[PDB]
C-alpha cells in the first residue's frame, strides 16, 4: 500500500473540509486507512476520521470543522493500522468551495429573495457575490451588493462566489418558475 496522489483538501469555510487522496492499488478505505488530524494550536486534541471509497484506489474524508478562520492550519496524519503512510498539513481557508444560497422566492416590480447560508460572525458573511440565472435560453445577473435580492420589470436559480484566490462556484440553489 502506497499513496499515489497526496491528500488535497477543500473546505466550505464553516463546518466541512473534504480531503481526497489516490492510492497505488485498490484499497478499502473504510477498513484499512485512518486519517488523524489536529488544529495546530495550544492544548488541542487530535481527532479521527474513518474514510470512504471514491472508486477502487481513491479515498475521501469529511473532516468536521469548528468553523474556519484564515489563521487555521491542521496537521494531517494517515495511518494504516499502526503504520504511518503520510505526514502533512493544510490551511482550510486556502482552498474554498462556497456553500449554496437558500430559499429563492418571488414577488411594477419582480423581487427575488434568498438566504445567505453563512451567519453574521463568519468571513463569508459579507464576501459573497451572487449570480442569478433566468424555458429555452437564459440571461445572468451579477449581484455584487451585500443585500440578497434582485428587482426588475416586464429555469431560475442563484449561486455564489467568494472574494478569495483558490475558490470556485457554489452549487446552484433550488429553483422557482416565474
Amino acid at each position, epitope marked *: 500500500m502506497k499513496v499515489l496522489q497526496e491528500p488535497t483538501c477543500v473546505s466550505d469555510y464553516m463546518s466541512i473540509s473534504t480531503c481526497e487522496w489516490k492510492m497505488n492499488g485498490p484499497t478499502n478505505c473504510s477498513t484499512e486507512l485512518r486519517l488523524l488530524y489536529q488544529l495546530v*494550536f495550544l492544548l488541542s*486534541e487530535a481527532h479521527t476520521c474513518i474514510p470512504e471509497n471514491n472508486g477502487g484506489a481513491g479515498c475521501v474524508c469529511h473532516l468536521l470543522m469548528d468553523d474556519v478562520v484564515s489563521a487555521d492550519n491542521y496537521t494531517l496524519d494517515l495511518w494504516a493500522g499502526q503504520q504511518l503512510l503520510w505526514k502533512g498539513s493544510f490551511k482550510p481557508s486556502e482552498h474554498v468551495k462556497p456553500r449554496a444560497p437558500g430559499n429563492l422566492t418571488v414577488h411594477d416590480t419582480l423581487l427575488l429573495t434568498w438566504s445567505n447560508p453563512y451567519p453574521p460572525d463568519n468571513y463569508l458573511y459579507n464576501h459573497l457575490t451572487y449570480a442569478v440565472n433566468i424555458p429555452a435560453d437564459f440571461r445572468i445577473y451579477n449581484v455584487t451588493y451585500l443585500e440578497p435580492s434582485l428587482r426588475i420589470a416586464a429555469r431560475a436559480r442563484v449561486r455564489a462566489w467568494a472574494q478569495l484566490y483558490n475558490t470556485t462556484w457554489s452549487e446552484w440553489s433550488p429553483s422557482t418558475k416565474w
Partner: antibody
Amino acid sequence: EVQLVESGGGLEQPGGSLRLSCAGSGFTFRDYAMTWVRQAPGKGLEWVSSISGSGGNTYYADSVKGRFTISRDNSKNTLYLQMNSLRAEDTAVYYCAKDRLSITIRPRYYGLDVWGQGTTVTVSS
Amino acid sequence: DIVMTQSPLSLPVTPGEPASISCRSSQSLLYSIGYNYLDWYLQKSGQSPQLLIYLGSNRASGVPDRFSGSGSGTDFTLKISRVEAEDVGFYYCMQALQTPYTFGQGTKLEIKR
C-alpha cells in the same frame, strides 16, 4: 459548585522525589486541559506544566524538562505532577487550574477560571 | 518566549478614584480577529489567584462591572473605574497563546486612606 483540591506537598530532600495530586469535581474532567503553576516565596507566578484532556499532549517548562512528569486519570478525575530529582529552587507553592476545553475540534479557553487551594513543596536537608 | 512587561509595579490610589495597569507583550497575542490571548488575575495575599479578565476584555463570572479590559496585539490595559478597599492585592497579566505561559512582573495596589 466546581472545585479543584490539591494534596501531596511537604518537605523532601535535595535529590528526592514527590508526587502532587489534583482532585477535581463539578464537570467532565476529561473534557478539559489542566495546568500547573508555581509561586516561589516573595516571587511571582511561573507556569510549570500543561496537559490536554485526552492525555495526548504534554507541555513542560524548560527548567523542569525531563525531571517533572505530568499525568492524569480521567476515571478517578485526578491529575498528577511527578516531581523527580528535586533541587533547592523547586521550593515554591504549587497551584493547578482548569484550562481549555479540548474535546472539541477547536479548543475553547476562558482563562484559568478555576483554581486549586495550593500545596507547598520545600526542598531542604 | 513572549516577554510580558507590566506597569506600574506600584499603584497607590485613593478609594473612589480611577486606576490603570498597562501590559506590553514582546509579540502579538492576537490569533484571529476578536481573539487576543491576554488574561488578568488578582491575588489577595494568602489566597489563590483568581481570573478577572480573559481574552483581552471578557469579564470572569464573579467580576463586577467596575473592572474593564482593553487592548490588542501587544498593548493591554486594565481599568478600574472606582477603586474600593477590596481591590487591594497583587495584579498579574498572563499571555496564554504560546507556552510557556508568561506573567507580567506584578502590580501592588495599595489604598491611601
